[PDB]
Amino acid sequence: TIPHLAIDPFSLDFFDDPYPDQQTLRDAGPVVYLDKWNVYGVARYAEVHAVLNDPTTFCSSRGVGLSDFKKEKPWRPPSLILEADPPAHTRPRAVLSKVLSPATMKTIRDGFAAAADAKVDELLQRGCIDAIADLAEAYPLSVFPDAMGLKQEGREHLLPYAGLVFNAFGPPNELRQTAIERSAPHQAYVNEQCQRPNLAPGGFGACIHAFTDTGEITPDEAPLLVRSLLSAGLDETVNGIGAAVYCLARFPGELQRLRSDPTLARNAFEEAVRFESPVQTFFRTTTREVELGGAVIGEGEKVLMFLGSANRDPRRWSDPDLYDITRKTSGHVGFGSGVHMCVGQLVARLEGEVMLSALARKVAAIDIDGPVKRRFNNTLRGLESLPVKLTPA
Numbered sequence: 001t002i003p004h005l006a007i008d009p010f011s012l013d014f015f016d017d018p019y020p021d022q023q024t025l026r027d028a029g030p031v032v033y034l035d036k037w038n039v040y041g042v043a044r045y046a047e048v049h050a051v052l053n054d055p056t057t058f059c060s061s062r063g064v065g066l067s068d069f070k071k072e073k074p075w076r077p078p079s080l081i082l083e084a085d086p087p088a089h090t091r092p093r094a095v096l097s098k099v100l101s102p103a104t105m106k107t108i109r110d111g112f113a114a115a116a117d118a119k120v121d122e123l124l125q126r127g128c129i130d131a132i133a134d135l136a137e138a139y140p141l142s143v144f145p146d147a148m149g150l151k152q153e154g155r156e157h158l159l160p161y162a163g164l165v166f167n168a169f170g171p172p173n174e175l176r177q178t179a180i181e182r183s184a185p186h187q188a189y190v191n192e193q194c195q196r197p198n199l200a201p202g203g204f205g206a207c208i209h210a211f212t213d214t215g216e217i218t219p220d221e222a223p224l225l226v227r228s229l230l231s232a233g234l235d236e237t238v239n240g241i242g243a244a245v246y247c248l249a250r251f252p253g254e255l256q257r258l259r260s261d262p263t264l265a266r267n268a269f270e271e272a273v274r275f276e277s278p279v280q281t282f283f284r285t286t287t288r289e290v291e292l293g294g295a296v297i298g299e300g301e302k303v304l305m306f307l308g309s310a311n312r313d314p315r316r317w318s319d320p321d322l323y324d325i326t327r328k329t330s331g332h333v334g335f336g337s338g339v340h341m342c343v344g345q346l347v348a349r350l351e352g353e354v355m356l357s358a359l360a361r362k363v364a365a366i367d368i369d370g371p372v373k374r375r376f377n378n379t380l381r382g383l384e385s386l387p388v389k390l391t392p393a
């Protein structure tokens with residue numbers, strides 16, 4: 001009663017144009033089996049949302065990648081937050097919630113906004129820039145590592161470690177194996193910077209250690225929690241910002257709208273997160289036999305949630321493939337949903353908004369002026385290079 005499909009959602013051919021295959025996955029049925037990897041898939045909005053919000057049956061403590069931690073050893077010690085279920089998840093989640101709090105956003109908003117304005121003006125002096133290297137990547141690298149309190153030495157390891165994390169959620173294909181193999185220098189840099197003497201006071205990493213006084217986390221838990229913030233955050237925001245510029249380049253009406261009302265910058269970024277879904281997929285593992293979309297799934301089965309597909313499901317979204325900066329994005333699952341919803345979402349929206357605000361106020365046109373290249377990752381969708389010509393306002 002369950003349709004078996006041969007689509008490999010982690011194949012380069014898939015990454016290059018996933019949307020036809022995502023309609024095939026949605027329309028085949030509410031639950032599919034992927035014979036290439038022996039996992040269940042859900043690609044419609046309603047089932048993805050249901051799985052995300054049913055953590056006791058669809059757990060994360062057995063890994064949110066293909067690998068099942070009950071069967072194989074994780075390639076690194078499990079995240080205390082992403083790879084945990086309630087109640088073990090609860091206290092590290094509260095710490096990160098507070099470290100990346102609304103109140104915290106007040107402390108960094110002016111520095112983050114200033115860097116974004118400065119960068120767009122710098123790029124407007126240039127003309128043809130790569131919207132990935134020069135902007136999507138350059139801007140987050142100029143604000144987040146400082147906000148973490150990271151030292152200068154070794155930052156060259158930061159993007160490699162992020163790309164490795166998200167490749168590692170994937171199946172054991174060449175992308176994953178290449179990433180994991182000879183990754184020890186990236187792991188060694190990160191693990192060393194998770195130690196308290198290495199984190200500048202007042203930054204995110206030092207504030208995590210300062211919570212060890214409260215009884216919420218123990219001193220030995222703090223370095224792994226800091227690791228979360230050296231794992232998440234950078235790559236997804238990079239891809240999301242690069243996607244926004246791309247959409248603003250491909251939908252010029254929406255740039256003109258945003259120019260006429262820069263207070264749309266925040267929803268413009270949220271809509272870019274829905275439209276691109278920089279985090280395409282996460283896994284759950286079933287804790288029991290469960291009925292989902294009429295199919296009975298056994299215990300200990302991997303379930304692949306297509307977040308990006310769920311964000312373009314026409315059963316939920318009008319004109320899902322159109323970028324609409326006045327769309328009401330509420331309910332999109334590009335940040336997840338339920339107990340695990342992105343705890344770093346205020347930092348991403350902040351970086352995204354202030355960059356889109358900078359563009360809204362200083363830029364009149366964004367014209368693609370060179371070969372566009374995709375960046376391939378088992379979990380993340382984003383561009384490798386986007387040559388554009390910025391016309392000053």
Ligand code: HEM
Nearest residue numbers: 081082232233236237240279335336340342343344347348
């Ligand atoms: C556009 C940017 C981002 C996207 C698309 C994104 C995506 C996601 C998603 C889909 C989840 C839920 C994972 C799951 O349910 O298994 C998640 C959780 C998480 N995110 Fe983000 N994220 C972004 C930015 C950030 C930032 C800026 C940070 C840190 C400052 C961050 C840190 C985390 C952490 C630590 C978790 C684990 C939360 C938990 O398990 O409760 N992310 N992210």
Ligand SMILES: [Cl-]
Nearest residue numbers: 076187190191
């Ligand atoms: Cl590590």
